[PDB]
């Protein structure tokens, strides 16, 4: 019990225009109830865009801020993000145990959630992250982290993440569509998929999001 | 130094106060001593990206956005472009996500005529778990990518020394961890061109005196 993602599909709203972002999000609201908001939108439109998303859509907000500073600064960032109304925040694990714990404390203090990003989906992730991915995931377990983010681009790596974090841990996965990940094969190990450009750059975002779901209902 | 964009008194202020009035007031009190301000997410997320342009116009200071950019290439480019649009002169980027992620930041910086600082090793205890073991390689990856500006830990003088010899004498190196995190200004400035200082100054009873005192110990 962590999050009830409708149709197991999370929207990565990375449009950097408020009117564009609100419009495309509105066109897939009937298919998506959980929206991931990142720095491209927030830095272009302000942290207030989170509250405006909650008010206009009644959707759950995951702030993909990939927090990666020292513990003290991590706390300030998490505190500002939750204050702005984020339900959960995504946090890098590579800065180490004390940096993650700093976020975990603020999340508990404010009654919100932390997602631990263990391994990234892009090719450069092989240089440093992939070799540390297992130990970061394990670190998360030792810290009592219940929420994780893993690479859709690597189904075998995503499967290892699942057996590390356990069956009752909650797992979401970006890199579906644009980066090359397949929706179905990703949902074999992950609870929900994150899809960005395959929806918000399509001619019809509604049809795109519906097309993704219609190839998933078997799962 | 004139071969690179240097910093007045080798002192960079880390302005991590989270409300506009205090941030503006403290920075103004120490403006006579610095000309470079590092602005991070604590201030920006609380007061908006407009605060970068405001500081730049009000104080005539160079702005380094400590955003520790650490996403995929595509998203890195969007973040850097938005940051430079906000008027920042430089942006700090994580190296751990790999070469393609750093190159995406470098492209936007070169396009818009701004700078990238590569964060190689962090200054907190947790940095020893995964970052330290990769820091040497991140540093030489940076050199190979064309990166000329770096960030290294003041809390570990021996690691900072290793970093300097990897990047050579021509690269520009700045270092946080002085004061609150226990780093010494003197030993750090043996390797770094400039120190980043936050709480030691901005939480002091007299921030101006705090900044002046640090510069004095640097001066000799
Ligand atoms: O490893 C990671 C974590 C962050 N993300 C984030 O997930 C989102 C994916 O968007 P796309 O579906 O357009 O690839 C985007 O916001 C990106 O920054 C990754 O794609 N991979
Ligand atoms: O490794 C790092 C990079 C980020 N920084 C940043 O540098 C600043 C340090 O200021 P303090 O003097 O208050 O520790 C603060 O903004 C922090 O987030 C580090 O301290 N260490
Ligand atoms: Cl004074």
Swiss-Prot record, chain A:
It comes from Methanothermobacter thermautotrophicus (strain ATCC 29096 / DSM 1053 / JCM 10044 / NBRC 100330 / Delta H) (Methanobacterium thermoautotrophicum). Belongs to the OMP decarboxylase family. Type 1 subfamily. It comes from the Archaea. Substrate binds at residues 14, 36, 64-73, 121, 174-184, 196-197. It catalyses: orotidine 5'-phosphate + H(+) = UMP + CO2. Homodimer. One of its GO terms (cellular component) is cytosol. Keywords: Decarboxylase, Lyase, Pyrimidine biosynthesis. One of its GO terms (biological process) is 'de novo' pyrimidine nucleobase biosynthetic process. InterPro entries: Aldolase_TIM, OMPdecase, OMPdecase_arc, OMPdecase_AS, OMPdeCOase_dom, RibuloseP-bd_barrel. This is Orotidine 5'-phosphate decarboxylase. Catalyzes the decarboxylation of orotidine 5'-monophosphate (OMP) to uridine 5'-monophosphate (UMP). Coiled coil: none annotated.
């Amino acid at each position: 019990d962590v999050m009830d993602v409708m149709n197991r599909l999370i929207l990565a709203m990375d449009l950097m225009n408020r009117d564009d972002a609100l419009r495309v999000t509105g066109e897939v609201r009937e298919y998506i109830d959980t929206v991931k908001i990142g720095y491209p939108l927030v830095l272009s439109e302000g942290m207030d865009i989170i509250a405006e998303f909650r008010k206009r859509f009644g959707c759950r907000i995951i702030a993909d801020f990939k927090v990666a500073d020292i513990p003290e600064t991590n706390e300030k960032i998490c505190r500002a993000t939750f204050k702005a109304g984020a339900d959960a925040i995504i946090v890098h694990g590579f800065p180490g145990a004390d940096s993650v714990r700093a976020c975990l404390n603020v999340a508990e203090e404010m009654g919100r959630e932390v997602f631990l990003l263990t391994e990234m989906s892009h090719p450069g992730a092989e240089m440093f992250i992939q070799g540390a991915a297992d130990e970061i995931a394990r670190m998360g377990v030792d810290l009592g982290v219940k929420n994780y983010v893993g690479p859709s681009t690597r189904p075998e790596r995503l499967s290892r993440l699942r057996e590390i974090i356990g069956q009752d841990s909650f797992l979401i996965s970006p890199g579906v569509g644009a980066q090359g990940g397949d929706p179905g094969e990703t949902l074999r190990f992950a609870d929900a998929i994150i899809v960005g450009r395959s929806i918000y750059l399509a001619d019809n975002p509604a049809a795109a999001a519906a097309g993704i779901i219609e190839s998933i209902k078997d799962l």
